[PDB]
RNA sequence: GCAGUCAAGCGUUCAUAGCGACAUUGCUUUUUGAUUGAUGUCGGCUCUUCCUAUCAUACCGAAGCAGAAUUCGGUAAGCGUUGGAUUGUUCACCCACUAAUAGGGAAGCUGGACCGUCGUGAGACAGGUUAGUUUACCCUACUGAUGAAUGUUACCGCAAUAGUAAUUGAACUUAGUACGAGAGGAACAGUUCAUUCGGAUAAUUGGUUUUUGCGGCUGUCUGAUCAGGCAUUGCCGCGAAGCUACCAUCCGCUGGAUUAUGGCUGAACGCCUCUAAGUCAGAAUCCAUGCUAGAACGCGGUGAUUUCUUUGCUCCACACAAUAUAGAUGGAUACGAAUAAGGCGUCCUUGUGGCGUCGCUGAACCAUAGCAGGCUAGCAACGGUGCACUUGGCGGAAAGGCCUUGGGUGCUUGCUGGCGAAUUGCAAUGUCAUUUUGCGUGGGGAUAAAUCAUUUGUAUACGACUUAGAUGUACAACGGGGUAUUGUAAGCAGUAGAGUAGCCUUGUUGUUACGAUCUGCUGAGAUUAAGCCUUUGUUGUCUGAUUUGU
RNA sequence: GUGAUUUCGAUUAACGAGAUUCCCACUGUCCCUAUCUACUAUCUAGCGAAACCACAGCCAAGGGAACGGGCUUGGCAGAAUCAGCGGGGCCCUGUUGAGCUU
RNA sequence: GUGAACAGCCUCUAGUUGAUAGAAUAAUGUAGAUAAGGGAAGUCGGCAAAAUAGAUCCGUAACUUCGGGAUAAGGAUUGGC
RNA sequence: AAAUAUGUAAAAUGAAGAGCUUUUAGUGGGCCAUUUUUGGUAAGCAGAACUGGCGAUGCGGGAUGAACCGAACGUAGAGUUAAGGUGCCGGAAUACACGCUCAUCAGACACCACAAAAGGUGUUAG
RNA sequence: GUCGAAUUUGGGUAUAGGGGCGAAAGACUAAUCGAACCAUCUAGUAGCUGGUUCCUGCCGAAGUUUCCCUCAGGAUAGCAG
């Protein structure tokens, strides 16, 4: 039994699942990130007004489960050059930004509270008078690198998570020559990149994550907590954190954000940018997830059709929720004893 | 003597994965350590320089009970604590070897 | 039935992909690049506000 | 198969001394198309893998193959190959279902023999002996999980190798077209669903309840009420969270090279030929892409690296020790390509050019004289070479090396001279190389972490994993507010309540005691993170232990 | 010797930890599983056996004769460990009858 | 006390609190339960579970050795006041 | 009439032990092959007689081994060989010479054996 | 399953192995009743299994004719002293 390609059923070496293939590059296009980092924040339900010629549900409305991924903008803190060799890709040079937040400096410690926090303090001394060493390393990357990846980290302090240690990753830069990639990275050092400058609505993306762990199960052995790469999840909405009426559509005029009544269960409210993706993705709430661009130019009309959302369910997920907003709940129940 | 015992993070101090907390053994050994420290005090040794220079456990005669063999495995323990203390080969050359040494000496100063 | 690796349907997918689908991809990427430039300009304007 | 018939050929050459390939009477047998299943010690299920002698799916070849459908055949094992009945378990076979329900190899519960008796044209004796041994806590395989050592510690990566996954049917349109007297009737391109299988997931619906969360019920017990205990989860209704379901939802691709076959050019063979040299397409095939793991003795990039632990750690120089060497003893001395061709030089009208020359081994080329290489005097030339510095480049495949600038400093065997060597006794490796590890000096440089213990739950058998913690938009315990679950608390009041009794101002809202229940205060009261969300409140905490150095 | 009794060797009410085929009802037997509780399973302190034991313990092919863990040739192969599981460990001789003949 | 009851369940007098302990809560095992739709399609074989169950009133077949079958089968009801 | 294949009796070659009489121990199966012979099967084959091999037996070789090829054994040194080999494993010529063959799983052998009767517009010599 | 008796049960007493007891089952008769247990005769009977204790030197088989009607068993020849 089982799909033999997902052997061995062993625990993933890390909680953050690796991106093992980026989209094939096209140098003529502008410089873009191939991938983004987010945190899974629960699911909900939407009503979509379907426009799909040929279908029995053409010009009719359907109800879909969706996943919400909390995506505050990522911070660019480094660049790494790769040279191809008869033995594969090899990293030649890593160049870091001059200043790094404590959010990312925590990633380099097991016991932050007890440390002198000396990480990158001697590195910052390279930006001293001329930046000659930094410029020499960037010149080396420009001269020899055939693949350029940018180092980014999440802003986990903007989430409701108890973790203060940010997740750090490499994201491939696609489009432009090597020198243009390196210039883009150098310009974006210590800057944020927003999720809408990477993805857009109606786009099909892939979700890479480590799945829910289940411990020992009856051959017997580890069940769950495996790296998985699920493909072709359509983006129903790229929402904005500073936008009220996140959950309001053209058909539903109720001014309300994406956050369900009482908050997501085991995850707070959404106060940042977010990605609403059709269906489910691997992982559970609060897990770090990697969103990747499609590896291939999708030939489906599903990748082409625009999504028109009619309604987003913001009822409580902490029970059998009946009301979208507390104002509606009060208007239904009426005046309670403690109101007088 | 560690077959099929539990794994513990407290082993990492010694590089092992299998460690335990044998209370009875600890009590006997520390009684012996206290006796040895008292003996050193009576002998007039400097208690700050004392380290366990010897310790040895071997098997005592077994004592049986019945309720199949049902025996205990008693121990003889001995230990010694000691003070730390800070801190012609003639050569047989042949005649040719002596001549070469002499030639080197003459060539040098 | 034709397989996923069927050569005829693969050729049909290739000829379809070369057209309207790729055009949609290219337009999407151009817009995304434009708003990425807008994002960088916005942050640099905040830095200029700091300087001013 | 039997007898033949002749023989393609053969038989020591020999036609009927003798054989003998390939080909030709009669059979259950009568004609005009009538009536004319085996298997008992095997069989079930599950379930892995393999074969191809292929049932279906893919691509082709032929056939009066019009179309549709089919038949026979070729490549092909990628992917699948039912639910039930059956007069003994089984397979034949039936009902249907399906694209099809192919055939095989490897392959854990389960539904006896012999000895002996009266007799014999003839039955019985129930006499006697003898056997029935394969029904996890160790080693290893498999599946998961830790882990010492490579200075330490931390983060981000690469990818050898190993595995690998998708499948089949339908619908729209093409179309009532092509094709056809008709009856009927396709497909490619473009769309949309479903089947089987797989990987996830919990918004919704359903199931589940020790949330003993809320409410209800019986019996008993705490004097009654209140509030509770016990009935081995006492029983019942609802029930969040969690878990979970083809009982719920989502997702599952695209390039090279080929097979059969169809060809192009084209000999062999002055025709011809898809084949010999060469070459174009082409199957669900192969290899990649993609997906999973990541060598715990594969590799890279990057961060920080301890102050007195009685100057610890690290990089240079000399100065001595110890170490052990898969094996120094002049130099690993760099075009590329072809071989039915090339290298070098020279010239021109500059190339697939003209002319000359070379190979036929590196048997070369360079180095190479000096106490294992000393100390001195000159000559000629301004070359050769080493060392410590310096100028300017170039090299990322594993660059860690190549080239160049300038001055200083030595040597010079290009040539001529002058002193020394002995005694290691006639040979004895006769010690001259380079790895590492320490100790001493003088020249500089830099001032950390990890683990335990505590803590979180995105993790978990234990390990392991993942969070947090020295004064902060810190953490915790309470409290507050949301969000949910249940279903209207305790107490009091009423002129509501089947009636019964007591009073008497014998009623037409006369009166009083008891009274299941009802009504109002009251969507009240209770619970609400333990793996819910949030917080201008209150109170507190902020630390012990161990180890690690190139 | 037969085993109640009656009626015509058959038949027979009542009864049965006796045997067989069905029906209603019921259902997790099943489609097809899922969840909850308790004790375990797990780790710790103390106490503390046994079976079995030539030696050992990775595979493939070969090794004529049940046959391979050791031999031949290959694949390989890296300290020390925890857990689950079970894949291995007819003619001859006499008697007797019954056919033929001097 | 409940109850037909020396049943089961709770209590008074009397007696006992003995069974190696602690920390966790994965699968599996054992014991005990629940379950949508379907309802024996499962299996050699309805094995095991489920369903039934006290009492009052009505009502009761074939067969019969006239004694039975019989609690046949099949209906209604059950609290408190 | 050369002799394949046995007897009798008398020249060759070899031989230091022979004959007789008393005594004592262990032993009392066969398997494989060659040769001849008689009888047979689709094909294997069966019954005899002889002679070998093995048993009680190590050593070299055939990668390996009951019956194959060499050779039988005190402890050592040197030399030469048997059978079998000499690209590398692995000691020893990637020797020399003349030819043949190209296999879409050649061949490197049991063979004077079975698939084996043939088929082929592969190639060579007759 | 049976549960007022062809019932259950204490104590006393009877029955003993060539036997007893038995609603009769090769049942039971003090942890194998095709016949109890204990000691002795008795170190009972061998077709047969298993084992059988230092060294070196030298010699060294057979693995088969025959007669006992033949098979076990024996005798004589053959081989070695």
Beta carbons of A199 and A73 less than 8 angstroms apart: no
Residues with their C more than 2.5 Å from the N of the next written residue in chain A, i.e. before a break, are 218
What is the enclosing helix (H) or strand (E) of A292? strand A288-293
Is the Cβ pair C28, A196 closer than 8 Å? Answer: no
Same CATH fold assignment for domains A7-72+194-211+224-338 and A73-193: no
Beta bridge partners of A274: A70, A239
Nucleotide nearest to A92 (CA to C1'): D301
The domain A73-193 is placed in CATH, from the list 3.40.50.720, 3.30.420.480, 3.40.50.1100, 3.30.1430.10, at: 3.30.1430.10
The approach used to solve this structure was cryo-EM
Sign of CA dihedral C37, C43, C47, C48: positive
For chain A, what is the radius of gyration of the CA atoms?
A: 23
Q: How far is the CA of A301 from the C1' of D185 (A)?
A: 32
Q: Do chain C and B touch: 3 or more Cβ pairs under 8 angstroms?
A: no
Q: Which residues contact A199 (CB under 8 A, 6 or more apart)?
A: A36, A205, A235, A238, A275, A291, A293, C32
Burial B84-108 (b: 16+ CB within 10 A, else e): eeeeeeeeeeeeeeeeeeeeeeeee
Interface mutation vs chain C, best among A27, A197, A294, A298, most C CBs within 10 Å: A197
SS3 of A60, please? strand
- Where on strand F do bases come within 7 A of a protein Cβ? 26-28
- Classify domain A7-72+194-211+224-338 by CATH architecture: Beta Barrel (2.40)
Interface mutation vs chain C, best among A23, A25, A30, A199, most C CBs within 10 Å: A30
Nucleotide nearest to A222 (CA to C1'): D144
Beta carbons of A116 and A129 less than 8 angstroms apart: no
Query: What are the boundaries of each domain within chain A?
Result: 7-72+194-211+224-338, 73-193
- In 3-state terms, chain A is what percent helix, strand and coil (to 5)? 15, 30, 50
Distances (CA, A) of A70 to A106, A155, A272, C42: 21, 11, 7, 22
Is the Cβ pair A200, C32 closer than 8 Å? Answer: yes
Beta carbons of A62 and A52 less than 8 angstroms apart: no
Angle at A197 between CA A131 and CA A187, to 5 degrees: 10
Supply the DSSP string of A162-204, one letter for each residue: S--SPPEEEEEEESS-HHHHHHHHHHHTT-EE-GGGT--TT-E
Using a CB-CB cut-off of 8 Å, the residues of chain C touching A29 are 26, 29, 33
Sign of CA dihedral B33, B35, B37, B40: negative
Q: Which residues contact A89 (CB under 8 A, 6 or more apart)?
A: A82, A83, A147
- Where on strand E do bases come within 7 A of a protein Cβ? 42-50, 80-85
Distances (CA, A) of A184 to A142, A175, B36: 12, 11, 73
Using a CB-CB cut-off of 8 Å, the residues of chain C touching A297 are 17, 21-22, 25
Residue A99 forms contact with C (CB below 8 Å): no
Beta bridge partners of B52: B81
Q: Which two tokens stand for residue B13?
A: 């101090």
Q: Measured from the CB, is B30 under 7 Å from any atom of strand E?
A: no
Q: Do chain A and B touch: 3 or more Cβ pairs under 8 angstroms?
A: no
- Of the candidates C17, C30, C31, the beta carbon closest to that of A297 is on C17
What is the enclosing helix (H) or strand (E) of B96? helix B95-107
User: What's the maximum distance between 2 C-alpha atoms anywhere in chain A?
Assistant: 80
SS3 of B80, please? strand
């Amino acid at each position: 039994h089982g799909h033999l390609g997902f052997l061995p059923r062993k625990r993933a070496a890390s909680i953050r699942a690796r991106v093992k293939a980026f989209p094939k590059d096209d140098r003529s296009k502008p410089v873009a990130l191939t991938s983004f980092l987010g945190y899974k924040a629960g699911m909900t339900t939407i009503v979509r007004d379907l426009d799909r010629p040929g279908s029995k549900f053409h010009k009719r409305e359907v109800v879909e489960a969706v996943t919400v991924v909390d995506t505050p903008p990522v911070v660019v803190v480094g660049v790494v050059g790769y040279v191809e060799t008869p033995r594969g890709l090899r990293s030649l040079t890593t160049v870091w930004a001059e200043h790094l937040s404590d959010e990312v400096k925590r990633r380099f410690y097991k016991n932050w509270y007890k440390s002198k926090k000396k990480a990158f303090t001697k590195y910052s001394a390279k930006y001293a008078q001329d930046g000659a060493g930094i410029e020499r390393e960037l010149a080396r990357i420009k001269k020899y690198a055939s693949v350029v990846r940018v180092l980014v980290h999440t802003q986990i302090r903007k989430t409701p998570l108890a973790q203060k240690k940010a997740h750090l990753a490499e994201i491939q830069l696609n489009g432009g020559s090597i020198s243009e990639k390196v210039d883009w990275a150098r310009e974006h050092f210590e800057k944020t990149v927003a999720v809408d400058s990477v993805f857009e609505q109606n786009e099909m993306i892939d979700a890479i994550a480590v799945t829910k762990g289940h411990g020992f199960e009856g051959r017997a052995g580890q069940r769950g907590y495996h790296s998985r790469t699920s493909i072709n999840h359509k983006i129903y909405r790229v929402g904005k954190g500073d936008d009220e009426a996140n959950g309001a559509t053209s058909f539903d005029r109720t001014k309300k954000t994406i956050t369900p009544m009482g908050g997501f269960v085991h995850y707070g409210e959404i106060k940042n940018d977010f990605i609403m993706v059709k269906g489910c993705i691997p992982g559970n709430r609060k897990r770090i997830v990697t969103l990747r661009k499609s590896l291939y130019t999708n030939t489906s009309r599903k990748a082409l059709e625009e999504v028109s959302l009619k309604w987003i369910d913001t009822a409580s997920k902490f029970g059998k929720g009946r009301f979208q907003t507390p104002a509606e709940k009060h208007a239904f129940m009426g005046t309670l004893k403690k109101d007088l | 003597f560690n077959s099929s015992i539990g794994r513990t993070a407290q082993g990492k101090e010694f590089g092992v994965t299998k460690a335990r907390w044998p209370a009875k053994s600890v009590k006997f050994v520390q009684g012996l350590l206290q006796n040895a420290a008292a003996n050193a005090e009576a002998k007039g040794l400097d208690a700050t320089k004392l380290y366990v220079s010897h310790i040895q456990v071997n098997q005592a005669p077994k004592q049986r009970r019945r309720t199949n063999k049902y025996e205990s495995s008693p121990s003889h323990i001995e230990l010694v604590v000691t003070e730390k203390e800070e801190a012609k080969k003639v050569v047989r050359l042949t005649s040719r070897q002596r001549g070469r040494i002499a030639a080197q000496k003459r060539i040098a100063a | 039935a034709k397989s996923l690796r069927a050569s005829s349907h693969l050729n049909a997918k290739s000829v379809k992909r070369r057209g309207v689908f790729q055009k949609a991809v290219d337009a999407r990427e151009q817009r995304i690049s434009d708003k990425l430039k807008e994002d960088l300009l916005k942050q640099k304007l905040e830095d200029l506000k700091k300087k001013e």
